[PDB]
Each structure stands twice: as structure tokens, then as C-alpha cells.
Amino acid sequence: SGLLL
Amino acid sequence: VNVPKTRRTFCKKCGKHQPHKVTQYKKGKDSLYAQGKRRYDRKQSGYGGQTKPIFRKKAKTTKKIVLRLECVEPNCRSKRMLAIKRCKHFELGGDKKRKGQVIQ
Amino acid sequence: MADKRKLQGEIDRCLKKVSEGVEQFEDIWQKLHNAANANQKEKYEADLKKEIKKLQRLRDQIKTWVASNEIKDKRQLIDNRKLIETQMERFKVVERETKTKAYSKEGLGLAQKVDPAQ
Amino acid sequence: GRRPARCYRYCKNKPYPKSRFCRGVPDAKIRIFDLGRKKAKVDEFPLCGHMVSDEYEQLSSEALEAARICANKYMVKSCGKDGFHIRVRLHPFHVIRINKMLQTGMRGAFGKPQGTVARVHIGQVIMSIRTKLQNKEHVVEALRRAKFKFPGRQKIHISKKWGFTKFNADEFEDMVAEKRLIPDGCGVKYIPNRGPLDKWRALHS
RNA sequence: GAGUUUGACUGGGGCGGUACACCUGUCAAACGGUAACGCAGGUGUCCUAAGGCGAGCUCAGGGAGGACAGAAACCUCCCGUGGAGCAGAAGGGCAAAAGCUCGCUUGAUCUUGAUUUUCAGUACGAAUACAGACCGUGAAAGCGGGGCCUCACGAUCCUUCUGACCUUUUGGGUUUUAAGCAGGAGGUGUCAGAAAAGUUACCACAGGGAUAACUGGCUUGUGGCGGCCAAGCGUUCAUAGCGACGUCGCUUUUUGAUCCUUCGAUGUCGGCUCUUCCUAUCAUUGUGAAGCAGAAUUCACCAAGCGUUGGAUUGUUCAC
RNA sequence: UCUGCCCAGUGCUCUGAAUGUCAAAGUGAAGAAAUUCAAUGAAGCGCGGGUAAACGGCGGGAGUAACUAUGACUCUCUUA
RNA sequence: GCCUAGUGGGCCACUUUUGGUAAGCAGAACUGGCGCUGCGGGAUGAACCGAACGCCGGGUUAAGGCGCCCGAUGCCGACG
RNA sequence: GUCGUCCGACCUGGGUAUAGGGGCGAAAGACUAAUCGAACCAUCUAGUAGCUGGUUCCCUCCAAAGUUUCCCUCAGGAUAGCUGGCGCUCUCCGCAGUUUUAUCCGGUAAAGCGAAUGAUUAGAGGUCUUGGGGCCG
RNA sequence: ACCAGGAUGGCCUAGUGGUUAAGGCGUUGGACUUAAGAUCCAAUGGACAUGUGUCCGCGUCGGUUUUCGAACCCCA
Numbered sequence A: 001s002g003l004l005l
Numbered sequence B: 001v002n003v004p005k006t007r008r009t010f011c012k013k014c015g016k017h018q019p020h021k022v023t024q025y026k027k028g029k030d031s032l033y034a035q036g037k038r039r040y041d042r043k044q045s046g047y048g049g050q051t052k053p054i055f056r057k058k059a060k061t062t063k064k065i066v067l068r069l070e071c072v073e074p075n076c077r078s079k080r081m082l083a084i085k086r087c088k089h090f091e092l093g094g095d096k097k098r099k100g101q102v103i104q
Numbered sequence C: 001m002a003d004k005r006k007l008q009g010e011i012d013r014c015l016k017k018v019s020e021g022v023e024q025f026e027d028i029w030q031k032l033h034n035a036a037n038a039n040q041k042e043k044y045e046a047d048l049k050k051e052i053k054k055l056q057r058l059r060d061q062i063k064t065w066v067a068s069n070e071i072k073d074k075r076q077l078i079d080n081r082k083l084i085e086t087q088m089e090r091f092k093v094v095e096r097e098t099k100t101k102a103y104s105k106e107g108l109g110l111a112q113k114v115d116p117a118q
Numbered sequence D: 001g002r003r004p005a006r007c008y009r010y011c012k013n014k015p016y017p018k019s020r021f022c023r024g025v026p027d028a029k030i031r032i033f034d035l036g037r038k039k040a041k042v043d044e045f046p047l048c049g050h051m052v053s054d055e056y057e058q059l060s061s062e063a064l065e066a067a068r069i070c071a072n073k074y075m076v077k078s079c080g081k082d083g084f085h086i087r088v089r090l091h092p093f094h095v096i097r098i099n100k101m102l103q104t105g106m107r108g109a110f111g112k113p114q115g116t117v118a119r120v121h122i123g124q125v126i127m128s129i130r131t132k133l134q135n136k137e138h139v140v141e142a143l144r145r146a147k148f149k150f151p152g153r154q155k156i157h158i159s160k161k162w163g164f165t166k167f168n169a170d171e172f173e174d175m176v177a178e179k180r181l182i183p184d185g186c187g188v189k190y191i192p193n194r195g196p197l198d199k200w201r202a203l204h205s
Numbered sequence E: 001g002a003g004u005u006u007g008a009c010u011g012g013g014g015c016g017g018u019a020c021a022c023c024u025g026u027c028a029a030a031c032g033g034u035a036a037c038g039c040a041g042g043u044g045u046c047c048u049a050a051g052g053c054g055a056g057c058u059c060a061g062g063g064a065g066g067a068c069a070g071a072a073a074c075c076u077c078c079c080g081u082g083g084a085g086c087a088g089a090a091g092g093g094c095a096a097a098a099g100c101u102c103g104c105u106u107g108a109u110c111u112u113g114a115u116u117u118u119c120a121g122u123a124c125g126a127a128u129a130c131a132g133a134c135c136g137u138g139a140a141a142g143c144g145g146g147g148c149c150u151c152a153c154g155a156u157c158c159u160u161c162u163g164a165c166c167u168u169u170u171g172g173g174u175u176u177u178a179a180g181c182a183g184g185a186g187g188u189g190u191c192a193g194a195a196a197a198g199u200u201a202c203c204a205c206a207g208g209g210a211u212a213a214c215u216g217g218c219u220u221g222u223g224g225c226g227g228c229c230a231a232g233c234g235u236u237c238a239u240a241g242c243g244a245c246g247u248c249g250c251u252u253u254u255u256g257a258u259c260c261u262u263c264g265a266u267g268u269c270g271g272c273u274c275u276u277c278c279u280a281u282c283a284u285u286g287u288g289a290a291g292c293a294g295a296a297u298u299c300a301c302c303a304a305g306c307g308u309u310g311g312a313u314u315g316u317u318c319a320c
Numbered sequence F: 001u002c003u004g005c006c007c008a009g010u011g012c013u014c015u016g017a018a019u020g021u022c023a024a025a026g027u028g029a030a031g032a033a034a035u036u037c038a039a040u041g042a043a044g045c046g047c048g049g050g051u052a053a054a055c056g057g058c059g060g061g062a063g064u065a066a067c068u069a070u071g072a073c074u075c076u077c078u079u080a
Numbered sequence G: 001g002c003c004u005a006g007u008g009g010g011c012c013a014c015u016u017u018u019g020g021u022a023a024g025c026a027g028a029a030c031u032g033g034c035g036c037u038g039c040g041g042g043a044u045g046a047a048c049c050g051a052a053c054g055c056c057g058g059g060u061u062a063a064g065g066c067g068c069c070c071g072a073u074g075c076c077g078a079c080g
Numbered sequence H: 001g002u003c004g005u006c007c008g009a010c011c012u013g014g015g016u017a018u019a020g021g022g023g024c025g026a027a028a029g030a031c032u033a034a035u036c037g038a039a040c041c042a043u044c045u046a047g048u049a050g051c052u053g054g055u056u057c058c059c060u061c062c063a064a065a066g067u068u069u070c071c072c073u074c075a076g077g078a079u080a081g082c083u084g085g086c087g088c089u090c091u092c093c094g095c096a097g098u099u100u101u102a103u104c105c106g107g108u109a110a111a112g113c114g115a116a117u118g119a120u121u122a123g124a125g126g127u128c129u130u131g132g133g134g135c136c137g
Numbered sequence I: 001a002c003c004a005g006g007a008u009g010g011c012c013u014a015g016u017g018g019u020u021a022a023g024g025c026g027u028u029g030g031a032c033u034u035a036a037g038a039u040c041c042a043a044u045g046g047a048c049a050u051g052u053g054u055c056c057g058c059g060u061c062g063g064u065u066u067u068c069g070a071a072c073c074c075c076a
């Protein structure tokens, strides 16, 4: 997925 | 600045103050057979590209003024150089300034 | 750096533009010197307005660059600014000599017009 | 607009007057420091009451104008339109700053001049009113009302002196009589026994 | 097509700026030293004199006079501790001067060492006393080896120039050359001195909570809420309800400020669902007060027990 | 169904002894020679044309019509 | 006199003190601490107060305390 | 499960051709043996790391630094300072994070503005040293 | 907010090194014409945006104000 960017 | 073309000053050959003619010192032509030039040429020949630094980051707007003072006595005629402070405009023997005169 | 080489490229482009500017100024100058009819006088008058005003914008950018402390040798800029001023003062002489009417206050104060060969 | 006075109540910084180093300072809100009969003589308004500070704090120019409006309104209501003389004895000289933040943060956080604020010590007079002796309760209520415009604790003190002078009210009248004080507008001029004798002859002619 | 580079400081980094080499006043707490992207400023120049000596004067400003002439042109007298000037920034210094005007000049020359300043007690730069010459100037005492002082600048390698009946130019000798020795310059301002453009959302590695983007913590400017004082509003009437000019607070449901925890990972907006808590109470219970006649509506108290909805648009919180 | 305007810039291309710069080799001279000086002088840069269905680009401020607006109109600055 | 490791991220407090509205904020001076350090006390606690430490017995203290937790007022404590 | 296409730039087996800064691409930096913004294997190679992690028995004695200056220096060095060890030269006059007696030094706190500079509030007393005006000329 | 600029006749623009106030349009007066434009002969005007410093002297150079326009305000 993708975390806090 | 303005310096005159004649100065009576010390001469190391005469051991005495003598009159001198004053000229601005010019950077001489580079000889091809100075040792550093020969080493530079043979280091730059072939492949490898540039082998010594090339100075770019120029910051001074002014060169230090150097005067060639040459003694006028025909037996001596000795040359030496005297370095004066930096100045943007340099004049040799221009005109002695005058006081209390009208501006035009 | 690329900033300095940028600045230098715009200097060379501007000095080139001043070079063709003075050349075209002296072109239209000698055409007005050879001008035949009145309408030719006012047209090369107007073309000298266009070129000297272009040249005045160019001197304005040159004087901003002379005021800058990012340039170390300014002899090309000072000589180009002198050349621009020379063209400006010549144009000012021509606009005086043409725009003064023959019987205005200036003409009735001092007529003169020495006309050197005459 | 401007911050509440609790931001600049305490004399934390060094004194910072407007000068050639502090420019772009707006004018103080208070401008007039004397109200009532300024032209009243020294024998017309003998009774003087002070509002004396009790803290080492900083009074804003806005507060110094609000208190002089409050005291002026009560004294024109109670003593009548001209029956008093109010002197505000602080002039706002200390400039307070502001670092307005709409980001830079505390980078280059030196303030622009926000306002003018006076510095008062423990025991220094803030406001003084001189008037006739029968207006004493009107003076006390005027300073007590003007107290609420000011932060911190102020006392009301009826002074021992005679109006806006450095001389005591009891010794004042007979030392006027002995020609030691010549009345000169609002206050007096002291005449010592030290000048040339032509001044003594002119005074005792 | 190849190889490489693409400064640093920094209340994260980038943009901005230069606090990167220097100088003044302050900070700076009365020896000295002393920090911040602290404050107000300046520097990379200028001078054949604005260097040096001697002599003569005295400046800024003010008063009073005198044809044109007036506010201001010039002549004169008086007062004049400097309120002028000394190239500049500022500070210090200076009156038969260090200022202004003349006269003569070139100590702004050559050569060792020592010292101060920054300092490691190193260099450079700058400076200080000396000494050895050779000069200038003055009647002489003296003074001068740049500028009244505090600033105005530059290593090695290379180049260039100057100096000596100089050294070497390697088997010997001669001559050109070349290399040395000594003294200036050509310059590195990132100023103890690499030769250097970007982009990466296709990205990679070593690390960092020394360092940002949430929550939490300190703070409360700003946001929000509430007081005190009472000039005024309210036909009157300060205070039913309000409330200017001022001033004191609270809260962390606003944004900031900071960077303490976490970068060998605490899943980053909304909505749906579901439970509970707070009160600064919209409604309902009980009340008090109104410029509360009734009705309606305000303001206030005990009070959070129980409620506070269905939808169009928008991902929205918010909004309507 | 049309495909407007701009060759100033940056590219591309054309022209070349009338030519500013121009390396090596070659040529002239001085010297003992290394060497130095000079004359000549290629392509390319500069110079001059052409090209936008090449890359690309294609303005500002005022006054002005029997209410008021608006601005067909005028003025001016300005570019390729 | 020689050789020399480690260090060259610091942080806190009285008083002085700069920026900031302020901050368990950023920056200096002086001295003392913490870091490097346990112990008695402040319930708890890097830094506050007392005091610095070999392994023990007796005694005594400091700062703190003495209703009960919890050693010590369970004094016929004083004045409000 | 629902779907795109299913006579044509269709689907498919075998053979063959192109190989790593190369191939091949109806173009997504896609594919090239589960590997692709440069495959895989072995070697150079134990590549370098101012950066993380770890670093093995006891007792005794001494005991820090986060500061100076310079550095493409700011997570690092050099240098001084602090430290330890090894001593050594003497002692068994000298010195001191201290006072006293002398003597100089300073411009901070305070204070001042009827003192210079700068800022600034209010009246008062004067005249012509000027001006603005009413009124008599 | 930061950087860079720009403020001059009534409008639109010039203008230095420091001494000259410039041009176009407009306005005004007279000619031409029956008259008006066009055309011809002439004339005036500038808070040089402000104050300060430099200089003998500034619109011009240098710092501070007051109105304006342009570029940037990024990574989460």
C-alpha cells in the first residue's frame, strides 16, 4: 500500500 | 591614482638616492621552454584531458600596480620594481592637481 | 557557475544587440543626412526615435549591470554605455535642430545656423 | 489589532526609546499630558493628589490615555469644567515590538515597533491632580476610577506638597511671604541668597 | 557515447540572506574575553597628495554694519571649547592642530633581527618600538620609512619581472639556453587558498528521531469563551439587555511557536457503525430577572437525566 | 470545414576569394643553432540570404456617442 | 621532562542577561551541579535540600519529619 | 459469476534469427528463464564506508571532555586544554581559585538632564529678533 | 511576507557623468475656409511622489517613507 507521505 | 614619471629614490646599485624614470610593469610573454611550461605541455599531451586546474572563480576587480623604477645614471641604469596599493584607475604622470580653481 | 555563465550570456547578447543598434542608428542617420523631401525627414526622424529609444532601454539594462557587483571587468560595459550616450547626444542635437521652428522664441532669440562650409 | 497589555506588562527588556536607531515608530495614543486649568496660578490649586504606582511594571500609552479620559471626565463632572489641573507624569518612551506571523518561524525574529509604553517604578507618580481643598473626595474618586484603566496596584496619596511644586504646603505660604518663592505660572521659582544683589534689590524694592 | 561534479551556514530542507575575510558603536553584567539569521552601520575602494617636513593662520554658527545686493554673491568688526574639517562607516583623537593656505619635497626608498594584535601563542594581513644605510624638511630641536588610530586583503605548484663581472647547466672549455638564490607581481572574496550544471513521481544504499510532515507535552500570540471599570446606547435611565476607551483571566473543539518522544515504521482525510465522557444548556424538569400584560422572546441559576432528525449539491471537515 | 500572423531569437539550409579570425604541414627572413619573427592562409566560426505542416512566439495605458453604462472612434507607448 | 588515551553532540539551577506574547523556547556571563554518583529527605522523580560511598558494631546528627500507613509528640506543649 | 473479441492488424505447435549499454518493442521503460530505469555466472574482492551493530577474567590505584584555533569544517579530523603512566631534579627556600597593608585600572548598577548630545510635557517673564493678522493711519 | 523594480506637463513616455527640463498627443492665440476638421504660423504648463544625506550645485547617486505593477510562496 503506502504509509504517511 | 596618479604617480609622476620621475622619482628621486634609493638605488641598490648606486647605494644612494638617484633619479629614476617610472614605467608600469607589464606581464611578460610566457616562454614555451620554462620548466613548468614544458612539464605542463608533456603532461597535457596524449590522453587524460586537462591535467592542471583552470582558475575560474575570479573575485578581484583590480590588479596591484607595479612600477618599474629605472635609475637614470648611464653607468648604472638599474631597474627594480615598487608595488603600490590596488586602484581601479591608474595614471602615470597625468597632471598635478590644482587648488582653489574654477570648475568648468 | 551556471548563474554566472547565464549572466555572461545575457551580457554578450545585450552587447551584440547594442552593436547592431548603433550600426542601424548610423544607417538611418546617413539616410536622414541624404533625405530628399520633408516626409522623408519626419520618417527617418521617427525611425531614429525608435532606434534611440531601443538603445535607451539597452543602456538601462547596461547601467543596472554596471551597478551590479557580480561583474569584475566592466570595460566593455562602460565603453558600450559611452557609445550609447554618444548616439543619444547626437540624436538630441538633431531633434533640437529639427524641432526648433524658424520664428519661435529660440529662433527670434538667436538665429545663427552657421552652416560650416557656407 | 494590538495585543492585550498582559503581553507587555513587565519591564523585561532594556529601555528602547525612539531615536536614530529605532525608526518607523507610530505616535503614542496619549498626546496631551495636561488637562483642566493649565493657566491656574500656584495659590489657586493648593491640594495635590497622586496616583502612585506600587509595581515595577509597564503602562501602555493607550491605558495612559484611557485613565486621563476617565479622570478628566469625572473631574469635569464633579469639580466642574475648570476647577482642577491634571498632569500625567509618565510619557511613553519605551517602544514595544511585535514579530507578526501571518513561514520563517523564529528566524530573524526581531520585532518591528508595535507601540509606545511608559516605565513606572515602585513609588513613582503616574497622575497628579491639583485643585482646591474642598475637592478632595472628588480627587480620590477620580484617581480611584482611573485606577481601573491601569494594570497592577496603584495607591492614591494626598501629597504633603502645594500643588505641582517641590515645597511643602505648610511652609509654602509664609515662604512666599518672605519672598523665597515667587509664583511663576503653574508653580514657583525659588530665590536663594546667592545671586547678585541687584536681583535682591529688584525683589525687595 | 564515456567519466565526473553540481559549496557551507541555516529555529527541517528549498526560496531569501551572508551573520563565510575584515572594521565601528552596542550587546557585554565598570580588566580582558564573551553567543544568536541580535541591533544600527560600513569594507574589497580613494589619494603625487588626502604621503613627509616647515611656516602662517582658525573653523561651524551667530550678532552688527556697508552701492546695486535681496534670505543667500562680497568687504569689515565682535562673540565663537570646536557646536567645523580631517576621503569614507561609526567610535576615539585633534585649535599658534591632526583642520585650512602656501613653501620645499618623495620616509610611499634599501636591509637585518625583536614585539603586539588573531593566536595554537602558527602563518598571512595590519601594527609597534629599535638598529644599519641613504635621503627629505626645518634656523634648529626634531619629525618622516605611507595616509591621526581602529578596516581596506592572499600560501605551496606554475608563470612573469628585477637583482649579482653570482651558482649549476653532471668528461673539459666557450656561447645561447635552462635550472637555482633573493625580492615584487599575476590569485584563490567558500578570503589558511578543489578546476565543476541540472532532473528523478522509475529510483537505490548507509544512517538520522542530532532533522521536517500526525497525535501527545510546554506556551497561548492568534482563534474561542468569560470577567472588571463605566464614557455612551436604550423616549428617560450607566448597569432589563448592552457597552466604547482601557484592563484581568480561562480553555486547548483554531491556527501558530518549539522540536522533548517515535524514522531496524505508532497505517496518513472524510463518511458509516458503536460505546462513553464533558458543559461554555438548543430543547425538556424546577427556578429567579426583564423595557415579562397574554402569547412570544431575552438574561441568569441548580442542572448533562433524556433527546438533538429526513434529504439535494460537494470526497469533503466546513458550508448552503 | 479550415489551417491566420511572426525568420527578432534558437536550429536547419544556401552563397563565398569581396573577406575578419583561422591549426598542422609548406614559404620568407634574422641568428651559431635550438629558436624567433613574418608572409600565406583549409573547413568551421563571424558576415549575408532562405525557411514556422522547424523549435517556438503571437502587448500595455488613457480620452471618447442627446440619462448612465459600454466603446465603433481617437491619442500614445511599444514589439519579430 | 617525555610519551599519551579518551574527549572536541552536552544539559540543569541562584544571580546577571539577549531575541521572543510566551515556552519543559533559542542564545551568552559567573559559579555549582547532573552527565561519571550511590545514600538520607522532597509520596513519586538525572539536576532541589542534606550529604558524597571500603566491610561492620556502638553513639550522634544534617535536611526532613513525629494521627495511622510509617521510625518519631501517646508533650495533660504556648498564643491566636 | 459477469464480461472484451471470436475471418482477420486472428489463435497456436515445431524449426530458425537477433544477447547485455546489447537485443526486441502497435511504446507500458515494457519484455529478455518467478530477475530488468541495464539479465545471469565466476573473478578483481576480505572493493571503500567521517555511518549502524558487537567487542570475551578478577581485584587494586588514578581519573575526564563536550571548550580554543584551523580545515569543502558542521554525525569527522588536526591543535591546545583536561587525563593517566613513566619518571627525573631537589626539599625532607618556594608556592597559593584566600585575606590584609600599599598602589594603580575600569564607566556597569545607580544617578543626571536648572550639565554637553538626543528625545520631550506644561505654564510664566520679555522685547523686536521676524511673521501672521484685527483696529488707527 | 521575501526579492527585484516603477512614480516627471492634462494623458502617454524621455532624461546621464552632476549643471542642459525633452518629445508625441492635448490646451491656447492667430492664419486658411461660408464654417468645422485636415493644413500653416506660434505660446504656456511641469508639487520632477515626499523629506534626508553626498556634492559648490541632484529629477539624476545613497539610505528611509507613501501609492503601484511583476515574479515566487515548494516537499509532505
Ligand SMILES: [Mg+2]
Pocket: B045, B046, B047
Ligand atoms: Mg593529442
Ligand SMILES: [Mg+2]
Pocket: D012, D013, D014, G018
Ligand atoms: Mg528581552
Ligand SMILES: [Mg+2]
Pocket: none
Ligand atoms: Mg546544508
Ligand SMILES: [Mg+2]
Pocket: none
Ligand atoms: Mg566584567
Ligand SMILES: [Mg+2]
Pocket: none
Ligand atoms: Mg604647524
Ligand SMILES: [Mg+2]
Pocket: none
Ligand atoms: Mg632609520
Ligand SMILES: [Mg+2]
Pocket: E147
Ligand atoms: Mg596625514
Ligand SMILES: [Mg+2]
Pocket: E156, E157
Ligand atoms: Mg599545490
Ligand SMILES: [Mg+2]
Pocket: E201
Ligand atoms: Mg511521470
Ligand SMILES: [Mg+2]
Pocket: E209, E259
Ligand atoms: Mg528530537
Ligand SMILES: [Mg+2]
Pocket: none
Ligand atoms: Mg485572545
Ligand SMILES: [Mg+2]
Pocket: none
Ligand atoms: Mg443618556
Ligand SMILES: [Mg+2]
Pocket: none
Ligand atoms: Mg518501533
Ligand SMILES: [Mg+2]
Pocket: none
Ligand atoms: Mg505495526
Ligand SMILES: [Mg+2]
Pocket: E266
Ligand atoms: Mg496500532
Ligand SMILES: [Mg+2]
Pocket: none
Ligand atoms: Mg453551569
